[PDB]
Amino acid sequence: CPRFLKVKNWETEVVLTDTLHLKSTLETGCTEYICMGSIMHPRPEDVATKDQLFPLAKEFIDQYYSSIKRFGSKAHMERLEEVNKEIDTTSTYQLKDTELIYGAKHAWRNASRCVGRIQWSKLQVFDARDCTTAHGMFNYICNHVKYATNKGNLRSAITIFPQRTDGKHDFRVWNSQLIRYAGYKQPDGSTLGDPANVQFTEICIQQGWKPPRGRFDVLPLLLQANGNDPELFQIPPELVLEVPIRHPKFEWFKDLGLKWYGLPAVSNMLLEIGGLEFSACPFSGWYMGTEIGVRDYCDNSRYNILEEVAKKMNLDMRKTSSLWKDQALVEINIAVLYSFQSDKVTIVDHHSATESFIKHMENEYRCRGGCPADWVWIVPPMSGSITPVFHQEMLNYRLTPSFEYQPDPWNTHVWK
Amino acid sequence: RFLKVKNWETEVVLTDTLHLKSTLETGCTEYICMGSIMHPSDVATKDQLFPLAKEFIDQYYSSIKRFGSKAHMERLEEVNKEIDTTSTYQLKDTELIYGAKHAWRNASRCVGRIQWSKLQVFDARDCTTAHGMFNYICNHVKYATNKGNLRSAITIFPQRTDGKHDFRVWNSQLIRYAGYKQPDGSTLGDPANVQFTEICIQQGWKPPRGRFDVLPLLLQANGNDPELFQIPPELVLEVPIRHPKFEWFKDLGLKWYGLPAVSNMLLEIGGLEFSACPFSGWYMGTEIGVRDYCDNSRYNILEEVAKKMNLDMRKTSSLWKDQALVEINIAVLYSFQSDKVTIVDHHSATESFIKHMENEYRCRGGCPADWVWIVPPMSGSITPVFHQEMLNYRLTPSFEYQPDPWNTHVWK
Ligand code: HEM
Ligand code: HEM
Ligand SMILES: Cc1cc(N)nc2cc(-c3ccc(OCc4cncs4)c(CN)c3)ccc12
Ligand SMILES: Cc1cc(N)nc2cc(-c3ccc(OCc4cncs4)c(CN)c3)ccc12
Ligand SMILES: C[C@H](O)[C@H](O)[C@H]1CNc2nc(N)[nH]c(=O)c2N1
Numbered sequence: 001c002p003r004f005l006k007v008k009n010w011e012t013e014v015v016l017t018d019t020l021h022l023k024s025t026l027e028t029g030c031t032e033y034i035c036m037g038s039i040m041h042p043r044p045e046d047v048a049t050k051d052q053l054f055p056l057a058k059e060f061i062d063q064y065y066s067s068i069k070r071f072g073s074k075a076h077m078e079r080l081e082e083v084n085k086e087i088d089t090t091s092t093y094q095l096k097d098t099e100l101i102y103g104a105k106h107a108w109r110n111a112s113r114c115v116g117r118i119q120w121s122k123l124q125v126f127d128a129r130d131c132t133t134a135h136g137m138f139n140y141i142c143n144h145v146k147y148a149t150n151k152g153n154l155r156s157a158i159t160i161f162p163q164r165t166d167g168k169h170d171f172r173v174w175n176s177q178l179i180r181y182a183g184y185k186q187p188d189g190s191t192l193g194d195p196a197n198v199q200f201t202e203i204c205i206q207q208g209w210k211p212p213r214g215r216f217d218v219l220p221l222l223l224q225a226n227g228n229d230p231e232l233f234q235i236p237p238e239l240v241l242e243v244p245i246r247h248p249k250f251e252w253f254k255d256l257g258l259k260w261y262g263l264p265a266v267s268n269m270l271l272e273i274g275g276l277e278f279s280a281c282p283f284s285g286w287y288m289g290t291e292i293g294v295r296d297y298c299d300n301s302r303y304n305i306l307e308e309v310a311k312k313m314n315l316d317m318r319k320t321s322s323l324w325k326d327q328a329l330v331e332i333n334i335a336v337l338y339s340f341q342s343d344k345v346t347i348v349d350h351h352s353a354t355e356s357f358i359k360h361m362e363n364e365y366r367c368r369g370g371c372p373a374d375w376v377w378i379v380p381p382m383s384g385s386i387t388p389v390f391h392q393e394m395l396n397y398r399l400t401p402s403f404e405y406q407p408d409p410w411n412t413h414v415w416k
Numbered sequence: 417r418f419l420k421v422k423n424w425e426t427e428v429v430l431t432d433t434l435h436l437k438s439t440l441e442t443g444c445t446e447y448i449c450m451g452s453i454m455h456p457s458d459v460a461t462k463d464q465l466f467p468l469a470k471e472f473i474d475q476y477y478s479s480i481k482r483f484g485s486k487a488h489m490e491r492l493e494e495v496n497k498e499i500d501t502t503s504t505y506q507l508k509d510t511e512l513i514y515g516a517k518h519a520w521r522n523a524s525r526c527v528g529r530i531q532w533s534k535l536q537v538f539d540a541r542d543c544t545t546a547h548g549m550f551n552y553i554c555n556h557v558k559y560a561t562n563k564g565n566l567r568s569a570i571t572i573f574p575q576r577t578d579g580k581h582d583f584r585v586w587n588s589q590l591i592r593y594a595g596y597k598q599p600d601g602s603t604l605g606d607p608a609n610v611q612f613t614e615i616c617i618q619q620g621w622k623p624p625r626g627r628f629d630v631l632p633l634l635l636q637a638n639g640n641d642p643e644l645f646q647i648p649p650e651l652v653l654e655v656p657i658r659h660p661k662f663e664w665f666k667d668l669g670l671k672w673y674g675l676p677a678v679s680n681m682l683l684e685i686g687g688l689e690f691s692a693c694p695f696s697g698w699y700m701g702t703e704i705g706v707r708d709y710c711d712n713s714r715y716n717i718l719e720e721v722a723k724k725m726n727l728d729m730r731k732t733s734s735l736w737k738d739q740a741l742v743e744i745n746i747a748v749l750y751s752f753q754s755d756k757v758t759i760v761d762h763h764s765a766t767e768s769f770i771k772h773m774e775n776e777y778r779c780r781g782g783c784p785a786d787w788v789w790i791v792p793p794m795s796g797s798i799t800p801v802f803h804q805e806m807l808n809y810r811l812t813p814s815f816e817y818q819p820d821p822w823n824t825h826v827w828k
């Protein structure tokens with residue numbers, strides 16, 4: 001691989017030089033002759049063997065001691081020997097609290113698809129590796145929600161449950177996010193609630209959940225501890241902060257009865273540190289408005305209120321070239337930002353977030369020698385080119401620690 | 417291996433076998449993806465040239481269902497003797513048309529390729545001077561414009577020989593507006609062309625110093641210095657931009673040209689290089705109304721439109737930029753349609769491209785596609801290409817980038 005790599009910003013002419021790509025540790029899916037940059041994702045027995053784990057742990061341990069300016073030190077060599085001894089006798093090892101916190105912050109810092117990473121070092125890390133039961137998982141998750149929510153002054157956070165051991169004792173959160181709304185397919189084919197969530201809603205109902213059958217029913221938590229069958233828990237509703245969506249000019253917008261929750265909390269990904277696998281690690285920050293306003297509302301396989309908004313706007317919906325879709329999309333995203341700001345719930349518009357990300361990316365190139373970024377995901381789903389990431393070249397590559405995808409647990413669980 | 421691409425909105429899955437036929441590089445590796453680098457990373461030889469020519473002839477006679485026929489075996493031998501004796505070879509007209517249509521078909525970044533086989537190919541390989549180039553280009557412009565009912569076209573000038581005798585169109589597009597760098601700092605006209613505009617002044621052009629001054633053609637023939645030509649104004653179709661609800665929009669004084677004709681790329685067929693090959697189609701509304709008027713380094717009227725819309729411009733969270741962008745694009749589509757000048761909105765175009773992808777996977781086993789470039793620069797996720805997984809790879813014949821001529825040309 002070539003040793004220096006330049007990315008150019010075509011709007012400002014700034015050229016940056018990436019050396020950090022030489023530390024990349026896993027595959028992007030691309031080859032010399034094909035590019036998978038727009039592919040979304042390019043056995044329970046399988047855990048890391050003694051031999052695979054040694055290099056992965058030393059790799060991480062070295063990187064940690066280099067970060068605290070103690071590389072090659074006595075404390076570094078001793079920690080190497082102690083980690084190596086644990087792997088030798090017990091086939092795994094345990095991270096220190098210092099290294100767990102470092103590893104979580106760096107999995108976010110390394111997350112190429114996240115436009116929010118200017119915040120990467122202000123992340124509250126909750127060590128939940130002492131959890132043994134799904135009730136205990138419920139306790140840790142409630143405390144996460146309340147802290148992160150902070151009455152609307154949101155704060156970013158991750159709760160890290162025990163690492164994988166033999167693959168038959170995993171901790172998993174079956175929900176894809178801690179807070180989502182239920183979706184119900186009707187016998188007539190239509191959908192009530194959130195169509196993205198129909199499958200998980202059906203699983204919950206099989207597991208015993210009594211559905212209210214409404215538009216905005218917060219889904220229960222489905223929680224698996226130590227490889228056991230998962231269990232249901234209702235989140236205390238006073239912990240679920242919500243914003244009713246209204247519009248600063250259209251008095252009729254409130255009459256649509258829309259609301260959204262304040263806290264985006266992803267709970268189905270896997271955190272990899274030093275070759276250790278934390279299959280339950282929910283993490284939360286705060287919304288970019290377009291994640292609600294464009295995707296959560298206007299996607300056809302979502303709440304698809306685009307037509308309903310355009311109807312109340314008196315827009316010619318007979319031809320696409322009227323841009324009636326584009327005009328409704330902007331107003332909805334205007335409402336979403338205005339409702340969150342009015343109720344003083346933290347939220348960032350896509351102009352401010354993309355402008356922070358450029359500033360962040362440059363500092364990373366300066367202080368770190370690079371910043372992996374996934375342009376396909378960094379650029380917002382509306383008004384792309386009137387944000388500065390559009391004209392920003394980016395290099396994508398996977399560093400560790402990292403957040404990884406993992407199969408949905410109902411596909412893999414061995415039912416007791 | 418076969419490769420699948422899924423559409424996350426329809427859950428339709430397509431299977432790509434076509435990628436196995438490429439051998440040009442993309443710039444990515446297994447460890448670093450360069451999908452958002454604009455130009456990731458010229459004289460042939462007889463040694464490199466025969467296999468490149470061999471593959472192209474093979475796929476031409478395979479396309480016309482006569483692989484391994486007598487005409488195929490004799491075109492093989494005919495091309496062999498000619499690279500032998502002349503260090504290059506000349507394409508039949510049939511092969512020139514096939515390769516030109518297939519370079520468009522292979523343009524991963526082009527959302528308009530459902531039209532790919534409807535392309536009028538103008539053979540200009542007998543041209544020898546810049547006066548001849550200007551005659552061929554006026555004819556192109558006039559055929560393609562067709563009084564508003566635009567038609568796709570390409571004009572192919574002689575191929576590169578030894579690098580010292582390139583034909584080049586120095587303009588990046590056949591029709592563009594001048595950009596004048598003011599003393600008081602700002603920019604009159606079009607900021608995208610400020611450099612080229614000054615190069616035209618440096619060659620003798622008399623600038624009208626207006627806001628919509630059509631630049632002259634600057635034309636290089638057989639390695640010689642370029643020469644200035646004014647396109648006859650009646651050949652240049654333009655649309656005054658107005659808005660169907662905001663009667664104050666016409667007062668902005670805006671207009672654009674109807675014909676997009678890219679003239680600075682390189683067409684490669686069968687190992688041969690065509691350094692001058694202007695090609696044109698019609699506009700997607702966003703090329704004008706998003707990029708040409710609203711980029712920072714462009715006409716940047718966004719602020720003035722939000723002004724006359726009396727919008728709150730103090731904080732970005734009011735999305736005043738988003739509201740203005742949509743209205744600018746409503747006007748553009750509304751003006752071209754009212755003048756019966758061919759234009760496509762980004763909803764219809766992306767929708768046609770999904771249909772084009774379907775056709776390609778069925779009959780051809782795939783369709784190279786650059787999601788970074790296919791997705792429009794506004795309202796991305798409310799178009800069907802946002803949720804469509806694409807595989808990008810390099811098939812030949814193709815359109816390529818080349819250096820600007822004012823960097824390489826040995827002046828005299
Ligand atoms: C602090 C405020 C944050 C903002 C504004 C933010 C914003 C975003 C957005 C807009 C996306 C794309 C979402 C989509 O298109 O559906 C994203 C992806 C992502 N974010 Fe952030 N995020 C924040 C916090 C965090 C935190 C705290 C973490 C982890 C510690 C994180 C890790 C990720 C990851 C891993 C992805 C990629 C998900 C995937 O690959 O599917 N983010 N973020
Ligand atoms: C017929 C109507 C056509 C439409 C609506 C159309 C639309 C587009 C658009 C929107 C782009 C992206 C431009 C940008 O946003 O920067 C593009 C790129 C491109 N088009 Fe098409 N196009 C058309 C015809 C053609 C024709 C006739 C050719 C050549 C024969 C062609 C070759 C290309 C190439 C090579 C690119 C990519 C250039 C690059 O790599 O930078 N297109 N087209
Ligand atoms: C912390 C934080 C703050 C925020 N503001 N936004 C986020 C969005 C994400 C995200 C976005 C899309 C995803 O992928 C969606 C898919 C559905 N089906 C196949 S991929 C996933 C993967 N769970 C996560 C993850 C974390 C976020
Ligand atoms: C035929 C046709 C019809 C149409 N409707 N639209 C087009 C847009 C294009 C295009 C768009 C951006 C480019 O940009 C690359 C660069 C600009 N500056 C430094 S690299 C280029 C390459 N000249 C071509 C090319 C052809 C088009
Ligand atoms: C850096 C980035 O690749 C570059 O600005 C590209 C991004 N995508 C684009 N997409 C379109 N349609 N047109 C463009 O000019 C660009 N520019």
Ligand SMILES: C[C@H](O)[C@H](O)[C@H]1CNc2nc(N)[nH]c(=O)c2N1
Nearest residue numbers: 038039040376377802803804805
């Ligand atoms: C097929 C395509 O890659 C897919 O729809 C992606 C495109 N880019 C995206 N970008 C973001 N930020 N979020 C997304 O969900 C997606 N979806």
Ligand SMILES: [Zn+2]
Nearest residue numbers: 030035444449
């Ligand atoms: Zn790639």
